[PDB]
């Protein structure tokens, strides 16, 4: 729906979002699919894991954490999230 | 030598306007390039400005007290001629100041 | 100085200057200006031609 992050406190930056160790361990195999020079190609698996482990709701804090892991812009992460339904 | 040493006490500024690619300024350019270090060392507090233009007329200006201008043409002047001009301009201060 | 006055203004900006040129006949001058503009534009006022209002206004101005 809204292409811009709605002013909801439930998806605010204060939401605590930390990946599980199993999700952290699962990231080892996903990153090996794409070259180390392009780790942003794992953004789709990262978003899938986030949606799986966050009650089918991707927090903005989770997106920020993914961007920190992926070494890619947070704007790019948000755009990739919104581009897909 | 002694005239180079007395420059700090004779005048207030020494300006060398020349042309980088001119034969008339070739002698002045060579004289400025070769002996720049000696005057810069012996008189470290003396303003010694150097400027170059594509078609400048070579002028060595001695500026004495009260802003007294002593521009002298050095176009097609040999290194000995440049040294003589420097000695003369560094010696006219007493006449110019008084 | 109507010449320079029109020349220093846009095409529509100099429109009423034609009325002041021919004070008694302000419609004929305006019609001439419109026809000249159309000729410069290479077209013709289809609606004005079909409505015959140009002819009626020219006849009224002449009268």
């Amino acid at each position: 729906r809204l292409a811009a992050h709605r002013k909801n406190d439930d998806n605010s930056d204060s939401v605590p979002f930390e990946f599980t160790p199993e999700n952290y361990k699962e990231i080892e195999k996903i990153l090996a699919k794409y070259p180390l020079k392009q780790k942003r190609s794992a953004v789709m698996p990262l978003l899938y894991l986030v949606q799986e482990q966050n009650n089918n709701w991707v927090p903005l804090s989770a997106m920020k954490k993914i961007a920190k892991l992926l070494e890619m812009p947070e704007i790019d992460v948000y755009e990739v999230a919104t581009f897909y339904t | 030598s002694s005239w180079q040493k007395l420059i700090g006490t004779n005048l207030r500024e020494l300006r060398f306007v020349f042309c980088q690619n001119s034969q008339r300024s070739l002698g002045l350019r060579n004289y400025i390039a070769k002996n720049y270090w000696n005057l810069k060392n012996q008189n470290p507090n003396f303003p010694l400005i150097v400027r170059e233009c594509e078609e400048a007329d070579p002028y060595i200006i001695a500026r004495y007290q009260y802003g007294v201008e002593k521009k002298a043409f050095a176009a097609n002047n040999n290194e000995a001629e440049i040294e003589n001009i420097i000695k003369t301009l560094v010696e006219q201060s007493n006449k110019v100041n008084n | 100085g109507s010449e320079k006055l029109i020349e220093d203004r846009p095409y529509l900006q100099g429109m009423p200057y034609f009325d002041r040129f021919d004070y008694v006949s302000m419609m004929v001058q305006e019609h001439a200006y419109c026809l000249g503009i159309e000729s410069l534009l290479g077209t013709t006022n289809y609606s004005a031609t079909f409505t015959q209002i140009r002819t009626m206004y020219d006849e009224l101005t002449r009268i």
Binding site: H5, R6, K7 | - | -
Partner: protein, 92 residues
């Protein structure tokens, strides 16, 4: 209430110092139209997109403009870019 030229005030009124008494604008703009329009209340609209023309018919007011009533924050009204009327969401 908040002092003008504050950071919060600049963020709120689009980097402008809003005048509450409206006399400052009534002198600067030489018309009390600011306060006269401020006398209007806030209107709740069901649709997330509204068509505002400042009047009743086409060319009877201002050109039609489409305003998005559904924003990131619920209940945030928007004043018309063509008229002084402001419209807000019906519920949120």
């Amino acid at each position: 209430n908040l002092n003008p030229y504050s950071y919060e005030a600049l963020k709120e009124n689009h980097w402008l110092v809003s005048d509450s008494s409206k006399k400052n604008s009534e002198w600067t703009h030489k018309s009390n139209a600011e306060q006269l329009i401020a006398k209007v209340p806030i209107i709740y609209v069901d649709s997330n997109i509204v068509r505002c023309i400042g009047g009743t018919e086409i060319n009877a007011g201002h050109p039609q403009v489409y305003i998005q009533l559904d924003t990131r924050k619920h209940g945030t009204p928007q004043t018309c870019k063509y008229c002084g009327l402001r419209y807000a969401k019906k519920m949120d």
